[PDB]
């Protein structure tokens, strides 16, 4: 037998079917980073931070909403596991550039996917750690590059991805594989970040607008009429999805079981103690199938401060927990995530958390395009109201346009509301719309960060010197050329 079999050995690159298998494998390595995509993009912001209602300890997870991560407890370690994925993409890239077995079309589509994914991972690294090492070759000591050089590489990889796809906006392998529309969404985000956080200005906002407009024109995408069906177990493959992480029976639980372990309530206290608004014990309801732990607790007051009446996204996003009082009344306790309801497998007693985790969907294209328009001093009204109309329902929205349609959603609802403000300011209206549309989708922290330090420090406990993440001890030991992130001394 062979004592030194490696994945770079030529016999594993002899057929198109092998390159396909290796591309499936790359999407499976990206999926291993999916819990980290959520942690990087959301819980440092304002949605969490209250005490788990049922009694759980938070066991360090509070360090995210409290922004108390530091050199001893970094919250996430080892650059979120991203370099392992990047190394393997780098292998795909060299093998595809070298092959004599693929069609020119097929080789170029693979290069579109692999350059897109590599840019996607470097852009999480840039926004989270800043200066980071640029590894571009497969390997079976090194200093980080300045953030400005990281951004150069991400933009080069976007251009190489576009070159690979050409004019093909199809989802060749489906919406759970990378495609041109995913490259164009990342291009919109990257040039907004370049333009706003790295001094690119108007020219970059125009690049971002042109990319997002290319998805509206050329990709097969549409808003689902029912916001809850965007996330339903059965309705994966729906045409609002641009790129999603596919979770599946016997393949991968959502966030490698860390959705269940952080955001799903415990069956024991739900069935023993709590009830719905009508006083019915959860022992008696489909909720009695949920069995996880709450380590990140949505702020109790967010449940009534996030959404205007009539917004269908409130019930799709959160369930409220109540408790019967000795005096007989039913009292509101706290909310839990209802966006990802999993499935009850045949003959099971507890839910399985097998929803896909969406990375890019058409409402995000529309709201990014609104943001690029607003940053250019142009009118964001049409995109904002396309997304609101879906949220409220067409007829209800039309009847109530003088209070719900942009730029009329303002007034008393906002007065003591730390989460969101009225439509009188375009960027606040868009932040507000993104907060309502993408709870539990890993966006809020990055949405504040793009707009700048003052937006972050206003609404979060983060301070301006510590917007990046620290680096854990084992990383710094293993690589003497790396420095701790700035802001994280003493
Ligand atoms: Na603050």
Author numbering: 18 to 157, 167 to 516
Question: Which statements did the authors publish about this structure?
Answer:
In the present study, we present genetic, biochemical and structural data that elucidates the function of NanU as a high-affinity sialic acid-binding protein that works in concert with its cognate TBDR, NanO, in sialic acid transport. Specifically, we have established NanU as a novel member of the SusD family of proteins that binds sialic acid with a high affinity (Kd of ~400 nM). Therefore NanU, together with its partner porin NanO, forms part of an integrated sialic acid-uptake system present in several Bacteroidetes species which we suggest as the first sialic acid-specific PUL.
The crystal asymmetric unit shows clearly a monomeric form for the protein in agreement with our gel-filtration data, and an overall predominantly α-helical structure, reminiscent of several other members of the SusD family. The α2 helix defines a motif pivoted around amino acid 50/51 (extending from Glu33 to Gly58) that is well conserved between the putative NanU proteins (residues highlighted in grey text), but not with non-sialic acid-related Sus proteins, namely SusD and BT1043 from B. thetaiotaomicron, both which are involved in oligosaccharide rather than monosaccharide binding.
